[PDB]
Design a protein around this ligand. Sequence first.
Ligand SMILES: *[C@@H]1O[C@H](CO)[C@@H](O)[C@H](O)[C@H]1NC(C)=O
Ligand SMILES: *[C@@H]1O[C@H](CO)[C@@H](O)[C@H](O)[C@H]1NC(C)=O
Ligand SMILES: CC(=O)OCC[N+](C)(C)C
Ligand SMILES: CC(=O)OCC[N+](C)(C)C
Ligand SMILES: [Ca+2]
Lengths: 51, 165, 110, 55
Amino acid sequence: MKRPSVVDTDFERSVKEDWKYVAMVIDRIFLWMFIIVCLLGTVGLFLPPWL
Amino acid sequence: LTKAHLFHDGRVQWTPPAIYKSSCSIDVTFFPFDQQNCTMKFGSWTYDKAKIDLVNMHSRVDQLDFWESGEWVIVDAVGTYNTRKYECCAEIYPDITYAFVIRRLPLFYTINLIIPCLLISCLTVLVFYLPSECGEKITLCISVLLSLTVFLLLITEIIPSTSLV
Amino acid sequence: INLIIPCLLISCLTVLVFYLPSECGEKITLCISVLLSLTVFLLLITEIIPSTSLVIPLIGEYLLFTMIFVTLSIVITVFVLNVHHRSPRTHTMPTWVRRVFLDIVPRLLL
Amino acid sequence: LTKAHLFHDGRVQWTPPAIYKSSCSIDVTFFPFDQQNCTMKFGSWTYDKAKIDLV
Ligand SMILES: *[C@@H]1O[C@H](CO)[C@@H](O)[C@H](O)[C@H]1NC(C)=O
Ligand SMILES: *[C@@H]1O[C@H](CO)[C@@H](O)[C@H](O)[C@H]1NC(C)=O
Ligand SMILES: CC(=O)OCC[N+](C)(C)C
Ligand SMILES: CC(=O)OCC[N+](C)(C)C
Ligand SMILES: [Ca+2]
């Protein structure tokens, strides 16, 4: 992810936009973990029985 | 107690109908793809082997006039002759045990339970892709949780309450 | 009266989520309500019809396919909500998306 | 097992009521506009065609 390299002047808005980007980053961390777990867990639960 | 067919050489043929409710342990590990093995144990109650002895008329259970149920199919239905002693009495009592191996047809429960469950589960990870400004992240994940909670109770009303598996 | 008509009413709302403005912040509520109502009616029908695998009621197939399409609409609506809330400070618009979705497709859709 | 009407010429008439639970295969393809075909199969249990024939 490449945060758009845009510069701000107002400090309060600038920070409130940094917080808004930390929230996005945290979501993407788990979006991968849950995607991986859902694919890994479901395969590791139903595949062995099918064999 | 239907009539019996009596021949002139002493042979007697008796084929009464019956409706039996026999207890069989059910494993639901691979439900709705499970394969049940329910047995019936038949034997003379009072007469032991020295007095009444059973003979396997034919190992396979007759199925020519079997009524296709549409939900189960009998993979194998064979009777086994066994003899074993009981603490009641000193003699050997025989018995014939019929094992009905019935395989479930999974189309119905796949469409009504499995597929609806998958569709709800597909939405588990969508919440993380929503933008926090939408103000609907909680509605999405809460709805999924309750939806799955109900689906776990519907299954709880079908499968037996066995703790083995 | 007791099954078909409510099912038709719920089906009439399947595509509405795509006409709701994103600012309303209630697309998700609508599509989730539609999905859960369809699932509830599928379960209600399940308790009436026999548990056979030889045939599938046409109503059952219709409800299942509507449920599938409502799930797809939920996915697409989540994507559209994510897109709608982008700004220069978080995402940068590629040239190709600008070109396409501001010149060609809007023109094609009148 | 109601009473049977017996005539002087040896005829016997028996009209007893019955409440039968007959299994039939249900087709729900066109539910709730479906049409069912549920059968009841009656016949003598022990008397073959050479001892009792139904008309
Ligand atoms: C079914 O059960 C009987 C008795 O419990 C056993 O002898 C037989 O092997 C079983 N068959 C299968 C396929 O499980
Ligand atoms: C009903 O079933 C019987 C035998 O199952 C069949 O002979 C008959 O044609 C069926 N009735 C109709 C209207 O198809
Ligand atoms: C003698 C007698 O009544 O035995 C009954 C019990 N059983 C079937 C275990 C022998
Ligand atoms: C002889 C006798 O009792 O037969 C009963 C079975 N059935 C109905 C198939 C003839
Ligand atoms: Ca709101």
